[PDB]
Amino acid sequence: MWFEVLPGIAVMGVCLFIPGMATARIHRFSNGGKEKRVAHYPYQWYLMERDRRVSGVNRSYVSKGLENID
Amino acid sequence: NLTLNFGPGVLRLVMELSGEMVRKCDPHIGLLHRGTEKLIEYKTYLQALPYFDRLDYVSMMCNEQAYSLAVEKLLNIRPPPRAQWIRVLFGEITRLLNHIMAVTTHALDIGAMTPFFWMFEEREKMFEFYERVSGARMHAAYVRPGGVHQDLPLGLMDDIYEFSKNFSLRIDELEEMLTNNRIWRNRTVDIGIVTAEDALNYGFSGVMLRGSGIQWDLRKTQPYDVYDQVEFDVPIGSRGDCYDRYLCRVEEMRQSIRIISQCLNKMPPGEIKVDDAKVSPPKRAEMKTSMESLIHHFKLYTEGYQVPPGATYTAIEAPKGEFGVYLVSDGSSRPYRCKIKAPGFAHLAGLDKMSKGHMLADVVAIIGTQDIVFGEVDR
Amino acid sequence: MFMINILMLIIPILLAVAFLTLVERKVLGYMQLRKGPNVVGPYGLLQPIADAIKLFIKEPLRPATSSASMFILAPIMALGLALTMWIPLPMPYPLINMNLGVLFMLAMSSLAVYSILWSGWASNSKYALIGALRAVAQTISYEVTLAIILLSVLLMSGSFTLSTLITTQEQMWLILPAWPLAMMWFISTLAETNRAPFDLTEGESELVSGFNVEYAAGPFALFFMAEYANIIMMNIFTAILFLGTSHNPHMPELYTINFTIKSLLLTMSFLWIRASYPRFRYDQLMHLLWKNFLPLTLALCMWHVSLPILTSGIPPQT
Amino acid sequence: TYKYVNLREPSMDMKSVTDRAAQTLLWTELIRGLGMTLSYLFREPATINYPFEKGPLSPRFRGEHALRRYPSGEERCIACKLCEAVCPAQAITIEAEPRADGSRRTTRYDIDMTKCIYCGFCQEACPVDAIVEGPNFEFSTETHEELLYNKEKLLNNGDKWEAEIAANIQADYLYR
Amino acid sequence: MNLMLALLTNFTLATLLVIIAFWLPQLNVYSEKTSPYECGFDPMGSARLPFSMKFFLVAITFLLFDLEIALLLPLPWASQTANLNTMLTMALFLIILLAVSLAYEWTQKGLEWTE
Amino acid sequence: SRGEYVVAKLDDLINWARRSSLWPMTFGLACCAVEMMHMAAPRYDMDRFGVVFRASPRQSDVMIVAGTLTNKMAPALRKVYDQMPEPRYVVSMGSCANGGGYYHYSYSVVRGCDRIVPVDIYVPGCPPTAEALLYGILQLQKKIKREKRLRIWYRR
Amino acid sequence: MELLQVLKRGLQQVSGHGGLRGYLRVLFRANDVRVGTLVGEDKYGNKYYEDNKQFFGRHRWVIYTTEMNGKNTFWDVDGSMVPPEWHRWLHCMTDDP
Ligand code: SF4
Ligand code: SF4
Ligand code: SF4
């Protein structure tokens, strides 16, 4: 019957879900639980590099708040 | 120009191409020539009957009918009425088998693959009517000179009625896929136009004539069996192209349900082979108690009945066109000459003309519209 | 961690292709009043695996008089490009976030025409060279419309970034204001990927042979893999372009589930169409592009360049 | 009597012309053909589960050959050679001689199953119901030489299919 | 670098699937095999495919239509200018000439496939 | 290990793939080809066994010779057989292809395709039922399952 | 509600074969998990069923034995394993088992 076609779709559906999920999870793992920074224009890249010089560690995804200003 | 070699029934087209167009088309046949017309000269008349199931192997029982009418004409006998109604009944169940093959394979060649599967579960049910009367799904050898082999089993006409009561919806679904489809009309309209005078002079018959507007059907002009006691209409085309012939075949399938509806209601009682034991074998229960009936069973199955000398061209309205046999007899139990007039032989001879000024992809559509089976073209 | 990301893209793509063959063979069968693969494994779930192993332990027949270097190049280029078109897709986060993602997709797509030409050139048959020149002529013709239709949609989106199409369609799908383009875009993708009713070379079998009819064994499986990956890729492109999904940065999985469902319904519409219509003649699919689509696409490109200006609806550049 | 399949003239009123324009630009008839293939998707398929299910046959089915016996074990064949005379493919070969008890029985009885056209004329000609075509249709072989039956092979078929062959003859001999 | 890794992996893997295709199986070659397929018959001429003029015109037409598209690609960026009356006139001028070009090939029988 | 065990299991795997993914190349020659089509029709659906409807000689694994082989056609059949990549199996369908059948004594017919190509399964009948041909294909799958290519290599 | 009924037949099939093991055994041997009335059994182990709600052709089937004349037929079934007396019933040449 027609529902004996779904198992093939379910396997194919899962295979197309993995690439989007893995990319979403790997980005957050490598950027401290946040979205990856998108830098399409130079001004965005200048702010990302400045963030890398402000954290102390060479990571642009480590944010310093008001605690760092005295 | 680009002389290509297309092919591997099996055909060998040797086409001369100048770009997309076709310049000359040369069909090379004989890839399925088997020497049937020479093998029949070594067989008795009964032994030659199965040879006719294998000429047009989509319209088996129509070929048998043509051979029986010819022999019955030279034998000067007449099959009983119940045999004739059976032969019209199974002569039209066979027209459905041929038109399904002729329309859905035509569609299969040009990309439409789904209708083939729908209507081959309808052919499969009709093959069970062949199997239940003769024991063979395709090559029944059920129609024989003098009538038919056996009577219909009890409960067969009910299943033909149940089947034929749903077959009009199956056609309608086929016509939904094709009739109004623009892709299917662009492949057929104004393809393979044939004028009436060319169709007559080139030897065409069947839909190849009626697609061009000629009013001619042998079932109505030279009736055989009981075709004058049933009512049906003859589809006629107007353009003379592939699309009109396609419609003519879909309307014939509708008119055969009309004929089958009547053969079921008007079936008479009686015997199913001529009550003349020098032509048709006796019943088995009298072969085992009567002295004369054992002598004739012995002679009919070793020597066979003798046909009086003479020659006859006997043709019928087979699904693919006029099918006839020129059968010569010398007075013995074996035919002296049996020329088989295969309609596809004349049609395939007009492929070159019908393909004038068409692309290479239209030659496929033209061959399908002629409904060519190379069992009969090559014999 | 990036090298892990690439393998979470390539490997699941091939698995999807392998099981698109099963899904196609069963959807076709049920539209034909039959079942399809249900013997090799439960419901045919092992059928894709059996075919792959069969093709890769067969004789890879290469003709003696074939240019060996190009005979090998064609399947490498076909499969290599197929996987390269998946790197910028926002599902919802691209592997490579390109500022010109839409333009990159067009370029790689136009390179795939070489695999068709090299395959027919390297076989020395002339039964496969005519098919190659016919397929090459069909593919270059129908990528004129793709480039113009794509351009028209980007005039409501404002840039070439694929991630921006998710923001253009944050209130409404683009299929409403652009269904005339979607209809022609959808049919163009059928003509690009040599799908029925535009399959005059893959499996015409009407006094015409395909360009890769001389291939066998493993090399053939590489042409087949690339062809089906592009089918899935082109329907993912259609979902992002006209049926955009809503993106929630805290639940990116919601986007992926909905985005995957639309991509499957669009991929099952390629199987649905193949079971329903006959195939065009060669001249008829050329007249469909040069005399019907291109005249309308040029008119709609003029219309979509001035509609934003006349309604004060020009999108943002960034 | 006749009818016109394709003799029509489309109406040229602006109502009908616009209808055809909508069909050309909106693909109405194409989208109507998708519905027919969508309905078939939701119909039960017509496939049987072979080899666990078998397509229906009838008592008259012509299958593999078999030589039969009387209920006492005597062979029915009396070497009359009627089946050899009528076989249109000349696929039967027979030799005979008086048996040690003086009876009329065969020494050779061969059926070349690659010449046979499976037609039935041999069981029609036989006057003692000795040669029949049983209902077996699943006897394909890996060699040509295995399809050249001799008398020993044919009697084994009869001794193997007599339970079923006798029943089929009972259900059809009144039609013969 | 992330892009060069992705390209290297995509084409490196596709190459491995080809070496294992030409080396894993068991080969056996002779003359009848490793010949052009044809259709089961012998070649009917020792000459290559005749040059067809109509296939050349589609290729050239695509190239000149492709080049005219290259000039249309930056339209998304061009709608952000302050000279919209000027910009809009040149956008429609290019698309119209692309239409005039098509209207010429059409009426001179350049889009026909019948000889 | 024993080595033999690994070879025994590799034989099973490759045999499983080959008999589970047979792609035939039908040489529809005469009436037996109509029954081959009925084996693809809904009632039997050979596609469900992994047997695709049709293929070309370069991607085919088994040839089904279904019909009368004439002298004018035999060279064409052999050339198609030679161009099939190996492994290649042949199934002879019907009395015409088995030993000549009704036309055995004709001047124009090859008396059995086995004079031209090696055959693996002989399917009898005139024509065989679509079920008989299906039984023949399933018998060929069992024949592939018994193949011992790697075991014999290990003992060379 | 009718939809809820569908998922109950799909559950009671698992019980109709004696549990999950029997359900999987018949799924991997016959590719079919239907349950029908038991008509009989033969001396070789073959069991024959029927279900007249099914359409003509699928209303009778046989689950072949796992051993027959010293041959392990757990996977290698074959249509010639049906003995003649049951061969007439399976092929619908008679209605009487
Ligand atoms: S069935 Fe016909 S061909 Fe076969 S042996 Fe009997 S008489 Fe001869
Ligand atoms: S017809 Fe009957 S009795 Fe006579 S030889 Fe043949 S099998 Fe024997
Ligand atoms: S064996 Fe019988 S059905 Fe088959 S081709 Fe020959 S005559 Fe026709």
UniProtKB/Swiss-Prot annotation, chain A:
<protein>
    <recommendedName>
        <fullName>NADH dehydrogenase [ubiquinone] 1 alpha subcomplex subunit 1</fullName>
    </recommendedName>
</protein>
<dbReference type="GO" id="GO:0005739">
    <property type="term" value="C:mitochondrion"/>
</dbReference>
<keyword id="KW-0249">Electron transport</keyword>
<feature type="transmembrane region" description="Helical">
    <location>
        <begin position="1"/>
        <end position="21"/>
    </location>
</feature>
<keyword id="KW-1133">Transmembrane helix</keyword>
<keyword id="KW-0496">Mitochondrion</keyword>
<keyword id="KW-0999">Mitochondrion inner membrane</keyword>
<keyword id="KW-0472">Membrane</keyword>
<dbReference type="GO" id="GO:0045271">
    <property type="term" value="C:respiratory chain complex I"/>
</dbReference>
<dbReference type="Pfam" id="PF15879">
    <property type="entry name" value="MWFE"/>
</dbReference>
<comment type="similarity">
    <text>Belongs to the complex I NDUFA1 subunit family.</text>
</comment>
<dbReference type="GO" id="GO:0005743">
    <property type="term" value="C:mitochondrial inner membrane"/>
</dbReference>
UniProtKB/Swiss-Prot annotation, chain B:
<comment type="similarity">
    <text>Belongs to the complex I 49 kDa subunit family.</text>
</comment>
<keyword id="KW-0520">NAD</keyword>
<keyword id="KW-0472">Membrane</keyword>
<keyword id="KW-0999">Mitochondrion inner membrane</keyword>
<keyword id="KW-0479">Metal-binding</keyword>
<dbReference type="GO" id="GO:0051287">
    <property type="term" value="F:NAD binding"/>
</dbReference>
<dbReference type="GO" id="GO:0042063">
    <property type="term" value="P:gliogenesis"/>
</dbReference>
<dbReference type="GO" id="GO:0061351">
    <property type="term" value="P:neural precursor cell proliferation"/>
</dbReference>
<keyword id="KW-0408">Iron</keyword>
<dbReference type="GO" id="GO:0071453">
    <property type="term" value="P:cellular response to oxygen levels"/>
</dbReference>
<keyword id="KW-1278">Translocase</keyword>
<dbReference type="GO" id="GO:0051539">
    <property type="term" value="F:4 iron, 4 sulfur cluster binding"/>
</dbReference>
Curated annotation (Swiss-Prot), chain C:
<keyword id="KW-1133">Transmembrane helix</keyword>
<keyword id="KW-0496">Mitochondrion</keyword>
<keyword id="KW-0812">Transmembrane</keyword>
<dbReference type="Pfam" id="PF00146">
    <property type="entry name" value="NADHdh"/>
</dbReference>
<keyword id="KW-0472">Membrane</keyword>
<feature type="transmembrane region" description="Helical">
    <location>
        <begin position="2"/>
        <end position="22"/>
    </location>
</feature>
<feature type="modified residue" description="N-formylmethionine">
    <location>
        <position position="1"/>
    </location>
</feature>
<keyword id="KW-0813">Transport</keyword>
<keyword id="KW-0520">NAD</keyword>
<keyword id="KW-0291">Formylation</keyword>
<feature type="transmembrane region" description="Helical">
    <location>
        <begin position="294"/>
        <end position="314"/>
    </location>
</feature>
<dbReference type="InterPro" id="IPR001694">
    <property type="entry name" value="NADH_UbQ_OxRdtase_su1/FPO"/>
</dbReference>
Swiss-Prot record, chain F:
<dbReference type="GO" id="GO:0032981">
    <property type="term" value="P:mitochondrial respiratory chain complex I assembly"/>
</dbReference>
<keyword id="KW-0560">Oxidoreductase</keyword>
<dbReference type="GO" id="GO:0046872">
    <property type="term" value="F:metal ion binding"/>
</dbReference>
<keyword id="KW-0809">Transit peptide</keyword>
<dbReference type="GO" id="GO:0048038">
    <property type="term" value="F:quinone binding"/>
</dbReference>
<feature type="modified residue" description="Hydroxyarginine">
    <location>
        <position position="54"/>
    </location>
</feature>
<protein>
    <recommendedName>
        <fullName>NADH dehydrogenase [ubiquinone] iron-sulfur protein 7, mitochondrial</fullName>
        <ecNumber>7.1.1.2</ecNumber>
    </recommendedName>
</protein>
<keyword id="KW-0004">4Fe-4S</keyword>
<keyword id="KW-0411">Iron-sulfur</keyword>
<feature type="binding site">
    <location>
        <position position="126"/>
    </location>
    <ligand>
        <name>[4Fe-4S] cluster</name>
    </ligand>
</feature>
<keyword id="KW-0479">Metal-binding</keyword>
<keyword id="KW-0999">Mitochondrion inner membrane</keyword>
